[PDB]
Homo-oligomer: A and B are copies of this chain.
């Protein structure tokens, strides 16, 4: 209880959530997910105009932390995936404007957290992969579809393949590519856009714009991770060469 896997910088127009496990590729431990949920909930209570998501170290996030998954039960793993989806839905449906800034190699729920944010930028060298369908996981699927279209989503998710910054830009997954040196200016621009409307009107606008399939998404996640043999499917995937 003395670590800080999530750093939160609070300013009047913006809170910045820095995933802070840089020796573990910002992988989502149960502790980090719970910290994110708490932070996001607090920001919604305080009607923070802009939430910024970033990662310390070499990347944004490698997604689910598979360290010691062998010593966790099938139930333990299901709970952690459910809490991840609950987090993603809170970020996706936020009354705050949300901004994500990705760099390095990003994976799974890490990419989904990025996807849940409305303004999305990455470094020209950044990379993304959502490989979970290889072990039967159905996470972030419809949200990714809503962004890039069903054709591109099938192409990418169906073969559980990587895609780079250029491809991410082409398919509309990122607004633009931007070096880390340009990130402070992007945050300022996002802060200005977020505060252009009052909290109640901003929340209403977000609610009106969003395609809400939260229940379908959570059901699909729950079913996928609750199929008997989840742990074995993970084991098989992690033993695979690429």
B-binding residues in A (CB < 8 A)? 34, 72-80, 82-83, 86, 97, 118, 133-134, 136, 138, 141-142, 145-147, 149-151, 153-155, 157-161, 172, 175, 192-194, 196-198, 200-202, 204-206, 208-211, 214-220, 222-224, 226, 228
When C-beta atoms are compared, the residue in chain B nearest to A175 turns out to be B151
Q: What CA separation (Å) do A186 and B78 show in the bound complex? A: 38
Which chain B positions have C-beta within 8 A of A78?
A: 75, 78-79, 82
Which chain B positions have C-beta within 8 A of A226?
A: 79, 82-83, 86
Which chain B positions have C-beta within 8 A of A142?
A: 208-209
Q: Is the Cβ of B73 less than 8 Å from the Cβ of A201? A: no
A199 CB to nearest chain B CB (Å): 11
When C-beta atoms are compared, the residue in chain B nearest to A74 turns out to be B79
Copies of the protein in its oligomer: 6
Q: Is the Cβ of B204 less than 8 Å from the Cβ of A138? A: yes
Q: A34-B228, A118-B151, A223-B86 are in contact. Are A157 and B201 (CB under 8 A)?
A: no
A-B contact pairs, 22 of them (CB 8 A): A34-B228, A73-B73, A74-B79, A75-B77, A75-B80, A78-B78, A79-B79, A82-B226, A133-B201, A133-B205, A136-B200, A138-B205, A142-B208, A145-B209, A158-B193, A158-B196, A158-B197, A159-B196, A160-B197, A208-B220, A218-B218, A218-B222
Q: What CA separation (Å) do A202 and B141 show in the bound complex? A: 12
Q: Is the Cβ of B197 less than 8 Å from the Cβ of A172? A: no
Which chain B positions have C-beta within 8 A of A34?
A: 228
Chain B CB within 10 Å, residue with most, of A151, A155, A228: A151
Q: Give the contacting residue for A150; candidates B175, B211, B216, B228; CB below 8 A.
A: B211
Chain B CB within 10 Å, residue with most, of A78, A197, A222: A222
Which chain B positions have C-beta within 8 A of A141?
A: 205, 208-209
Which chain B positions have C-beta within 8 A of A201?
A: 133, 136, 138, 224
When C-beta atoms are compared, the residue in chain B nearest to A37 turns out to be B228
Q: Is the Cβ of A219 less than 8 Å from the Cβ of B209? A: no
Q: A150-B146, A158-B197 are in contact. Are A204 and B222 (CB under 8 A)?
A: no
